[PDB]
Amino acid sequence: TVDPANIDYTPENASSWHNYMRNVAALLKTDATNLYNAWNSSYKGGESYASLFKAHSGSPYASALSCVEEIVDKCAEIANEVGTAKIGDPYNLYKAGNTEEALYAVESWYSWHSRDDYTNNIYSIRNAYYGSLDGNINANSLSTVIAGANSSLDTKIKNAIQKAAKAIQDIPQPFRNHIPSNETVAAMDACAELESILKNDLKSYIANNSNNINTDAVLNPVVTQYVDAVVVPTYKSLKEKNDALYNAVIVLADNPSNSAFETACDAWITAREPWEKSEAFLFGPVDEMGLDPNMDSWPLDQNAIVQILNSQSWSDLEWSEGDDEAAVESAQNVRGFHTLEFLLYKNGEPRKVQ
Ligand SMILES: [Cl-]
Numbered sequence: 001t002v003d004p005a006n007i008d009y010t011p012e013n014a015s016s017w018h019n020y021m022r023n024v025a026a027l028l029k030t031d032a033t034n035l036y037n038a039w040n041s042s043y044k045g046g047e048s049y050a051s052l053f054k055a056h057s058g059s060p061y062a063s064a065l066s067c068v069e070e071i072v073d074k075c076a077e078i079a080n081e082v083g084t085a086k087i088g089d090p091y092n093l094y095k096a097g098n099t100e101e102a103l104y105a106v107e108s109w110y111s112w113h114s115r116d117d118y119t120n121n122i123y124s125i126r127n128a129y130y131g132s133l134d135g136n137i138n139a140n141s142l143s144t145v146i147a148g149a150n151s152s153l154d155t156k157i158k159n160a161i162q163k164a165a166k167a168i169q170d171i172p173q174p175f176r177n178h179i180p181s182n183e184t185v186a187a188m189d190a191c192a193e194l195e196s197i198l199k200n201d202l203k204s205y206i207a208n209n210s211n212n213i214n215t216d217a218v219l220n221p222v223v224t225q226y227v228d229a230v231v232v233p234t235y236k237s238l239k240e241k242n243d244a245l246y247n248a249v250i251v252l253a254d255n256p257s258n259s260a261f262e263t264a265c266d267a268w269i270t271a272r273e274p275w276e277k278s279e280a281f282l283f284g285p286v287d288e289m290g291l292d293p294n295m296d297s298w299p300l301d302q303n304a305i306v307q308i309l310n311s312q313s314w315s316d317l318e319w320s321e322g323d324d325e326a327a328v329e330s331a332q333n334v335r336g337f338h339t340l341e342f343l344l345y346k347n348g349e350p351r352k353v354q
Helices: 014-040 049-055 064-095 099-105 114-130 142-149 151-170 182-207 216-254 258-276 291-296 302-309 312-316 336-344
Strands: none
Touching: 014 049, 014 216, 014 291, 014 302, 014 312, 014 336, 049 216, 064 099, 064 114, 064 142, 064 151, 064 182, 064 216, 114 142, 114 151, 114 182, 114 216, 114 258, 142 151, 142 182, 142 216, 151 182, 216 258, 258 336, 291 336, 302 336
């Protein structure tokens, strides 16, 4: 039996709802701050991860080529995950007749945000390839290097990125109500083509010494630009927007209303954007010590969330004075962005008070 874990906000569960929302938002705030600081300030008490990656002076990154292979591998990985898991798992469940399991498997369905989520994941690949955030092809980017060496290959990669993004957007809104559509099919097909053009055509071409684009002289500026213009700024934005999200959740808890829910939902979407646009670089700090699953697990233990919301302990909890830390280091499957999403949204719209 599929368990949707239906619950609505009521006067009787409101205190637990406030406290648990706060807890999950506090954890998200802490995690995003630590992720940004690991890159920007200090990784494990030493130089920042940005400095480590740009220097690439020892294992596991002893060359700019090694860095770039990791960059391209992690672009390929998110293309694979979007096509075959985020879109593909619900699709294959649905086609097998497990249609209700399919509907409840869709990542970001609570907010009807799956299309935009997965599209942002593809824009993460764009950003990595272009060395920018704002859709500009930077002078110091993989795209510029490949364009100079093999313009055909560059054009095919750029086209493949665009075709995956547009194929996901073409899925009728919301994806959860159109899982078997031809467009789900076209979006899967486009993601598969993109996944292939990155991990096969691109990595091989760079790795081939005879193409003369894998030296540190060629690739160092690409690595430096990627870290300084793409990765660190994205994590800075994530930290700032998870901070904003925390404040929005506190105001909702302190003065609950339909408008306050809407405001917290706005903050959730806002914070999700840099997160989703970071998913082509799920390596280093975010891929250590369970950070990614602490921030973004899917699926959730939805029945456990309902039990929390109905619990007297979370209803009765009091917080330490002026303390923004979480009360409880919650399990992966009852924390993160999607747990807050569950707490803020129902069936594609902000939740309402009774
Ligand atoms: Cl959806």
